[PDB]
């Protein structure tokens, strides 16, 4: 990353700073990485964060300089398509089924996140074009 | 191997013959298992046995115990315990055998509408019930003149007489009628008087 | 069609001639069961055209010959 | 002689508790009676052999997720014969019947395990992608 990227990232970082001390929480580090185009797992985020404890995750604040090595480390379609075809073979996916699997398996997300990403993507049958949804969420 | 972290195993327990435990650290060949209980335990792996692995939950509760992938005492006892306590089903196939658990309670399942529902249906079609054995015997007798038997085994008080009673009630209903079933049930008091005894474990 | 009500296998802290006869009757019934189930499995393996050799019989005949043979 | 003349059907009755409480169950009573009724030895004798049996139709319906789209034929039976030999190493561990697949005891739970672990990995990867998009949208808001 060059100076310009670091400056834009620091500015965004400060925009996510809700206390004015130039810092974010550990729990925001992943959010910033994802906000910058990365798609790390929560496990990967905790690993680059150093597997923080609950207390520091909820109250310890870190500035851009400590976040930066983690962003660097994280930085350093057909598989995604087959992954979606797991839940298919008419090129569709049930909205109920995608909602169920995203809210009930793996590292379960909230219903509101799933509603937000799925809003406008299911048709009248309750089918999602997964190639279009995948391209959209990867753009 | 099959014994990974977040596997589940049955471990022996004094007060219920087996209890569930989750394998809290994956096993490698040797003497240790870190186990977690619904708390925290370590269990000696000793001559040798691995603890009996646990079936995936899609299999648990199915109508036929041989549908289970791991077949062993605690998985069988668990499937019967869940079907009986949670479902309040009292009948379960094991292979050819029908297992029947005494509820000590009356149940609606012996109604003549259900008698009709079972008639003409093969064992695959419907959830197990004593009528599903009676109907099989009846149609085996129809196919081929060979006589058919029904054999009922268990410690006294397990309900063998009531099972026979509903078995012949099935025949009386499906054939129609000649007041056999009344006479047969009226004979039971004398055969129980001349033929039954108190025993150390069990009366009648 | 015939219905047989019979006692099952029996074990107490003390076991005696009654329990010995009951357990021998139950060994006989369990043999006839195992051999019927084995017959039905050989039929189902014919139905699916699978070689018979894969299924082995489990035979309690040595305990019956222990109880009822001459010099039993 | 009376029974061997005849074709039997078996019922086993078990008595879940001594005190006749309605719909209560006692594991230490029942293990005794399942032992005395020979249910447990019947099950032990079935655990050797091929206790678990699957129709090719229902097997394929259940485990399409394991199959790569390269190797899904429109003939299910040959697809299954191709796939199971990849998924399970030992041909001894299963037999291809005419209409049904026969498994030894372990194998169906192993297939359920590998299915669940694959589906977990796919779920996690997709949901991290979704979370990443939603944080990128929230970053666009944070600039705006
Ligand atoms: N399927 C069933 N539905 C309802 N009650 C049942 C059932 N099976 C058994 N019972 C009850 O179990 C108790 C004893 O059953 P029963 O068939 O009379 O056994 P029994 O008289 O002790 N014959 P035995 O077991 O040889 O001593 C009674 O309270 C029955 O109501
Ligand atoms: Mg009674």
Author numbering:
A (entry chain E): 4 to 79, 86 to 97, 100 to 150
B (entry chain D): 5 to 33, 35 to 43, 46 to 54, 57 to 186, 190 to 216
C (entry chain D): 433 to 504
D (entry chain D): 649 to 792
From the paper:
The myosin motor domain consists of four subdomains: the actin-binding upper and lower 50 kDa (U50 and L50) domains, which are separated by the central actin-binding cleft, the N-terminal domain, and the converter domain, containing the long α-helical extension known as the lever arm. This coupling ultimately enables the amplification of small rearrangements at the active site to large, force-producing conformational changes of the lever arm.
Note that the two AppNHp data sets (4°C and 25°C) were combined to increase the overall resolution. By applying a mask including only the central three actin and two myosin molecules (central 3er/2er), the refinement was subsequently focused on the central section of the filament (central 3er/2er maps, resolutions stated). The resulting cryo-EM density map shows strong density for AppNHp, indicating high to complete saturation. Interestingly, the density also suggests the presence of two ions, both likely corresponding to Mg2+, given the size of the density and the buffer composition. In particular, myosin is strongly bound to F-actin and adopts a post-powerstroke lever arm orientation. Based on the presented structural and prior kinetic studies, we propose that our AppNHp-bound myosin-V structure represents a post-rigor transtion (PRT) state that allows to visualize how ATP binds in the rigor state, prior to the transition that involves a switch I movement and promotes detachment of myosin from F-actin.
